[PDB]
Amino acid sequence: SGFRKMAFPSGKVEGCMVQVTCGTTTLNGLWLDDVVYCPRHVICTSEDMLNPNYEDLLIRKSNHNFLVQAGNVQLRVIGHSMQNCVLKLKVDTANPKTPKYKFVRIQPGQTFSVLACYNGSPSGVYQCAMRPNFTIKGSFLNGSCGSVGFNIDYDCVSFCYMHHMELPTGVHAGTDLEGNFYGPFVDRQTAQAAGTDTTITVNVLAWLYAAVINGDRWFLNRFTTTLNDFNLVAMKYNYEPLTQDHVDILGPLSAQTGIAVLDMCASLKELLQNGMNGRTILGSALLEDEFTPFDVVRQCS
Amino acid sequence: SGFRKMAFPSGKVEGCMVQVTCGTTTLNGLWLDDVVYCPRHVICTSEDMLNPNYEDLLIRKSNHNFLVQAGNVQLRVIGHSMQNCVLKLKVDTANPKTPKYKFVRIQPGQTFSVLACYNGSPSGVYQCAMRPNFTIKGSFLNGSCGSVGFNIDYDCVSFCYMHHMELPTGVHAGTDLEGNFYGPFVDRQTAQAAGTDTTITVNVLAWLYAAVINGDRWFLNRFTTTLNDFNLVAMKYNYEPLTQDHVDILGPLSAQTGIAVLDMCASLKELLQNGMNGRTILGSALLEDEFTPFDVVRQCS
Numbered sequence: 001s002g003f004r005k006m007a008f009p010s011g012k013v014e015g016c017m018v019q020v021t022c023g024t025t026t027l028n029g030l031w032l033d034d035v036v037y038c039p040r041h042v043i044c045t046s047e048d049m050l051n052p053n054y055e056d057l058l059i060r061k062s063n064h065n066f067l068v069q070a071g072n073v074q075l076r077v078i079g080h081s082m083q084n085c086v087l088k089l090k091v092d093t094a095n096p097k098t099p100k101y102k103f104v105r106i107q108p109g110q111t112f113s114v115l116a117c118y119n120g121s122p123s124g125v126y127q128c129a130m131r132p133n134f135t136i137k138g139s140f141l142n143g144s145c146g147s148v149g150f151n152i153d154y155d156c157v158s159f160c161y162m163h164h165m166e167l168p169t170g171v172h173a174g175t176d177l178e179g180n181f182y183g184p185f186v187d188r189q190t191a192q193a194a195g196t197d198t199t200i201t202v203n204v205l206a207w208l209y210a211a212v213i214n215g216d217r218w219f220l221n222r223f224t225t226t227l228n229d230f231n232l233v234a235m236k237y238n239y240e241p242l243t244q245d246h247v248d249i250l251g252p253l254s255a256q257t258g259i260a261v262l263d264m265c266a267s268l269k270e271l272l273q274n275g276m277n278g279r280t281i282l283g284s285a286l287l288e289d290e291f292t293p294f295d296v297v298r299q300c301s
Numbered sequence: 302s303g304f305r306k307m308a309f310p311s312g313k314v315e316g317c318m319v320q321v322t323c324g325t326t327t328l329n330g331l332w333l334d335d336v337v338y339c340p341r342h343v344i345c346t347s348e349d350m351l352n353p354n355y356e357d358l359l360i361r362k363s364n365h366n367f368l369v370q371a372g373n374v375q376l377r378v379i380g381h382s383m384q385n386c387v388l389k390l391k392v393d394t395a396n397p398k399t400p401k402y403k404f405v406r407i408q409p410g411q412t413f414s415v416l417a418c419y420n421g422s423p424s425g426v427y428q429c430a431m432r433p434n435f436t437i438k439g440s441f442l443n444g445s446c447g448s449v450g451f452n453i454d455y456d457c458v459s460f461c462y463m464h465h466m467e468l469p470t471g472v473h474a475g476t477d478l479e480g481n482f483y484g485p486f487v488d489r490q491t492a493q494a495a496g497t498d499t500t501i502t503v504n505v506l507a508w509l510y511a512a513v514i515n516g517d518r519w520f521l522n523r524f525t526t527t528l529n530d531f532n533l534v535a536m537k538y539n540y541e542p543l544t545q546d547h548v549d550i551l552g553p554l555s556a557q558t559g560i561a562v563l564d565m566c567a568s569l570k571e572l573l574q575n576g577m578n579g580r581t582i583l584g585s586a587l588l589e590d591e592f593t594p595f596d597v598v599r600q601c602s
């Protein structure tokens with residue numbers, strides 16, 4: 001047993017990470033087949049970044065303007081185009097380490113693994129949820145742009161995130177691999193802020209089931225509630241509404257524990273009102289909301 | 302910014318993980334060069350669990366009693382020997398993916414990345430610390446034995462842990478890669494229990510410095526403390542003694558933040574007396590002790 005926040009093994013993705021240099025800017029790119037994907041702001045000087053015309057900046061650019069390096073091997077750029085906020089560099093070499101993959105856009109509340117990278121070199125890996133406000137609470141520094149987020153389902157790597165910027169609250173925003181931002185953000189140096197976040201209700205419940213399955217049971221009670229009443233509780237505490245779909249998705253855990261979702265909701269109601277006040281569940285004094293039901297099942301059975 | 306329990310990219314280790322089968326028992330082994338390392342308890346039966354005589358059980362084995370798969374490739378065992386609690390199977394194929402590597406025995410408080418594996422197939426990656434009571438708080442199901450923990454500093458993978466068993470309290474015990482258990486544990490089914498655990502004080506201070514580095518100062522105070530007075534107080538909260546070695550180790554973080562180590566110790570004293578009063582530090586409502594001073598500099602730079 002035990003329950004830990006746990007990333008997918010990153011090896012299939014490490015073999016895809018390259019360094020992309022345009023001018024004085026170096027960041028990371030994703031090398032799949034014979035194309036390298038990276039954030040389009042790689043072409044931007046500091047003054048360009050305040051109000052960039054990417055159409056016209058890229059038009060002033062050429063193939064030789066981009067340096068791509070995989071390990072200590074330079075890949076030659078034979079073409080370049082822009083899709084939304086993502087730059088696509090055609091190289092003269094198909095990545096022989098290209099995994100079975102697809103580009104996927106993840107839903108708020110769902111999790112993925114982040115491979116943090118610097119100068120094309122993988123540095124660390126951790127799990128993130130797509131927050132309801134479309135940010136992720138990552139760990140990224142100078143040079144991490146181009147780092148990617150992914151899931152793995154039977155040797156298929158599903159890429160869902162590319163890192164573009166840090167927000168003033170220290171949370172992070174990026175795009176899917178087709179260059180569409182998650183959230184109302186732009187790849188420009190301008191005043192931007194995360195919206196007030198909310199807590200992913202179904203994930204907190206999934207995590208309470210994980211705590212029960214692992215012997216943590218003190219918060220259980222004989223009481224059950226209704227969706228209508230709880231969701232009124234959820235509003236007061238900036239919790240997402242719980243739908244019938246959410247209750248269904250937790251079906252497995254409710255069966256495994258004999259605690260119905262509305263009965264677990266009654267437990268959740270009680271914790272929201274009183275507060276942790278220092279006491280712990282699964283070694284946390286917060287209600288953790290970045291574990292999905294799948295994440296729990298994949299780990300507690 | 303951001304601060305996260307961050308694992309090392311697992312790719313270099315995934316290419317070394319194999320499946321070892323003996324009798325009806327299957328677990329994981331570590332394939333480096335022409336040797337596969339695995340827990341020696343792969344050779345016990347249901348009647349050998351309480352007081353196995355490992356030397357006697359091993360002498361009755363032929364090389365072909367051992368089945369080793371790498372992916373779907375069979376490796377042929379051409380030799381075997383036992384070193385402490387680890388079995389070393391020689392195979393006719395040196396692993397072509399063997400990284401630069403080395404075996405290290407770690408001390409309590411040190412962290413490492415765990416690649417959880419089942420049936421030779423890597424499953425997830427997460428961070429652990431060696432607790433002062435020589436267990437680790439992992440996430441392991443049956444079939445995870447032989448999963449390894451490691452650090453990666455400049456392409457050299459240092460292996461420091463191989464998983465052997467779950468203890469009654471849900472925590473985990475294993476050996477270094479020379480087969481010597483961490484702690485007083487034995488690879489027998491006999492009644493064993495972890496000693497009472499304590500908090501890794503040097504790590505909590507490192508993490509407090511990490512919080513300052515990411516711009517949080519609310520928990521500092523105008524007080525200082527002697528090393529001895531801090532220890533007298535901290536051990537009333539089941540914290541490990543802080544030694545001069547620890548103080549020396551925090552020197553670089555002390556310098557980077559401009560907060561003397563004993564001033565930080567005064568802040569920790571107060572946090573233990575007060576709690577968080579509804580605030581958080583780097584996302585947590587408790588005092589986190591599984592980031593080392595080295596991990597902090599790694600992640601914050």
Ligand SMILES: CC(C)(C)c1ccc(N(C(=O)C2C=NC(=O)NC2=O)[C@H](C(=O)NC2CCCCC2)c2cccnc2)cc1
Nearest residue numbers: 011012014015016017018070071072073095096097312313
């Ligand atoms: C395709 C070419 C021939 C261009 C190539 C192949 C391998 C490397 N890689 C080396 O390490 C080298 C091997 N031989 C050399 O001569 N130079 C190198 O750089 C990296 C590597 O395989 N990482 C593994 C990936 C699986 C998990 C563990 C780490 C690498 C691979 C892809 C992107 N980035 C880095 C570089 C280039």
Ligand SMILES: CC(C)(C)c1ccc(N(C(=O)C2C=NC(=O)NC2=O)[C@H](C(=O)NC2CCCCC2)c2cccnc2)cc1
Nearest residue numbers: 041049140141142143144145164165166187188189190302
């Ligand atoms: C606002 C200034 C100009 C100070 C800035 C610029 C770039 C960075 N970023 C870097 O990577 C750096 C590159 N060169 C440097 O010298 N310093 C850096 O920090 C990333 C990032 O926010 N980019 C966006 C891209 C869209 C427009 C706004 C910036 C970043 C940093 C930390 C964590 N995640 C991502 C940080 C700050």
Ligand SMILES: CC(C)(C)c1ccc(N(C(=O)C2C=NC(=O)NC2=O)[C@H](C(=O)NC2CCCCC2)c2cccnc2)cc1
Nearest residue numbers: 011012312313315316317318319371372373374396397398
């Ligand atoms: C050396 C031999 C020839 C014995 C070999 C080579 C490759 C495989 N591996 C396959 O996946 C296969 C490829 N071709 C096949 O025909 N059969 C396979 O199983 C796994 C693999 O490469 N993992 C990578 C490792 C770096 C991170 C990303 C994933 C693998 C490698 C080592 C241990 N265990 C599994 C199996 C065996």
Ligand SMILES: CC(C)(C)c1ccc(N(C(=O)C2C=NC(=O)NC2=O)[C@H](C(=O)NC2CCCCC2)c2cccnc2)cc1
Nearest residue numbers: 001342350441442443444445446465466467468488489490
């Ligand atoms: C004897 C009992 C029944 C108590 C037992 C046997 C094996 C396991 N272990 C398995 O992996 C299983 C294999 N076959 C099964 O049927 N159930 C299992 O749990 C691992 C483990 O503790 N081994 C030690 C090795 C030295 C001797 C004592 C056990 C394990 C399990 C969970 C997490 N980490 C490691 C757990 C318990």
Ligand code: NA
Nearest residue numbers: 017018071120
């Ligand atoms: Na690379």
Ligand code: NA
Nearest residue numbers: 318319372421
């Ligand atoms: Na394998």
